[PDB]
Symmetry: C3
């Protein structure tokens, strides 16, 4: 009910369909995406295009009114495992902003065609939160370490232009452009693509957090600053962080 799945010849297009919340993820949306990725070899299909309905690709997470919110983090991990394990190449058609969980989702695609008006961001420093190690490593591999420091330490937005500059965007273009590229990719040798995808994903970005990383991760997630950031967002005011 929250995604749309269509297919032209050998390209399967999966569309996030929660534009009323800029395609922000919840448990149902994540579950539905995971099922669609796993099935995509039903198939016939030899490539997937992943995209969002409307103005945004995916603006993060919105668990409001969602019953299975407690399950969401683990289901989200299962979605990433499903994409990583898929033998099919996933071309992300990043049609608009990809923020937070949306940036993670875009990075888990195998290739990216990015709309002129899209941007990417981890606003973690504004929320007081902390990321898993893969998010940090894969970002660094895609924008370069220097820009990754700015994105993570200062919530810097990455424009489509700079995304193309660094390789985060393979191309600037529309959903149609991504579907055309995917159609060409669907004519290439599947076992070659499968080997290259596995080796590339196994560059070390899939990293277990170190003990010190986990300590800092827990400290951030459990902090009062995280609560303050929430209340300040609601009350339309700047947050007053304390580092605790």
């Amino acid at each position: 009910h929250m995604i749309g799945i269509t297919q032209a010849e050998a390209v399967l297009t999966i569309e996030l369909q929660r534009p009323e919340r800029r395609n922000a993820l919840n448990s149902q949306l994540v579950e539905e995406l995971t099922q669609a990725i796993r099935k995509a070899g039903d198939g016939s299909a030899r490539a997937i295009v992943l995209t969002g309905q409307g103005t945004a690709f995916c603006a993060g997470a919105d668990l409001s009114g969602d019953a299975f919110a407690a399950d969401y983090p683990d289901r989200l991990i299962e979605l990433h495992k499903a994409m990583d394990a898929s033998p099919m190449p996933v071309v992300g058609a990043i049609n608009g902003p990809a923020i937070g969980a949306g940036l993670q989702l875009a990075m888990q695609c195998d290739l990216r065609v990015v709309a002129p008006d899209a941007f990417f961001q981890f606003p973690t420093s504004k929320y007081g939160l902390a990321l898993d190690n893969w998010s940090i490593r894969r970002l660094s591999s895609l924008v370069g370490h220097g820009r990754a420091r700015a994105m993570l330490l200062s919530a810097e937005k990455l424009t489509a232009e700079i995304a193309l500059h660094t390789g985060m965007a393979n191309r600037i273009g529309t959903l149609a452009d991504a579907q055309a590229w995917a159609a060409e990719i669907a004519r290439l040798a599947p076992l070659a693509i499968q080997h290259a995808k596995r080796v590339l994903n196994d560059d070390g970005a899939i990293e277990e957090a170190w003990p010190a990383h986990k300590e800092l991760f827990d400290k951030a997630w459990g902090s009062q600053d995280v609560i303050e950031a929430q209340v300040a967002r609601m009350e339309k005011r700047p947050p007053k962080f304390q580092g605790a």
Copy 2:
């Protein structure tokens, strides 16, 4: 008989001389290159320039009519070991297309000066084949992970312009330009260069394939798709891959 070796002052230039096949490698060409690299400290020389005769740097491999074809893969590994172990800096003068084994050879150079009309490519996805891990890691370090995904998953060509953009090309220029740069490098301190080269090559790119990588590598190399790609190439038609 398939290479030319000349020297001006302290720069030794090694030229691939098989332009009738765009300098595609075979066992003899590989053996001769390996011997010339090892000897290059005979020497006198303090830098090497590696280049190809005519229009291409090296367009891949052509083992047709070559007696020692079965030996070729192991001899090729020995050439890379020889370059990696050489105390001399190897400036690749990439005079034209560097494809497949030619791209590997260019990446094993220590520095690259790239002709305006050259391009680099791994057409592995078109042939149904799979690469060793170093080829993938060193490519990723030189073009960035994002562009490396496109080059490997979709056979995307890297132009000289984009090579300079990413650092795959240190400079755009001709053989003469590379020889001039090499002459300056030959005046620097050899032990400093030797230390830096060893550390740089030991960035982790020299990686043993993981068990899953080897399984996928074997599946691709042993597939019917690889045979189909061959026959389709001969019969002047698009290949019909089956993923087996």
Copy 3:
């Protein structure tokens, strides 16, 4: 006596004050910097700006007339440990050339705003010397592997323009620009910044040199070529290296 420490609101600015030698490091300057970094949470402060007085950020090392010269290498290591362990983000305002130890210092900053006329360089190949592994890894992460090969093997200078291109410079601008950015960063959530900084610095760049690296490092540092480079510098003439 060799640094200046000031603070506006929650940004602490630390200024190297040895412009008579282009802020080249010695034992006292290093000791004073280390103490100032450790104290910076005295504090009040939530971000640090590191900069140099006059025309250069830091042009290397000048131990001439410095009593504790034998202590300098270990004290320098302690400064880097202090910066790496600091919970505060350090914005380097690279106001002019950053060469050698100055380039190391700039790379140990968390973010960099770089003056139009600044450049970065490791002239190690001109001096006959060898670097620690982190210097090489962190450089590679910031300029890309390809440009890092040129900087290390041929003493190539990195301009401010190319620094911005690669991500070594997060922005081109002045000390004032860096202080303004730092002021914004000081309003973000400290525990988020601390987590991201630790994970980013733990990308593997902090690497113990391999046995072969240490052998080559010692050979270079103990060579006659290093002495020759010194004498040639004094006698205003090109060095005649022997590779020993």
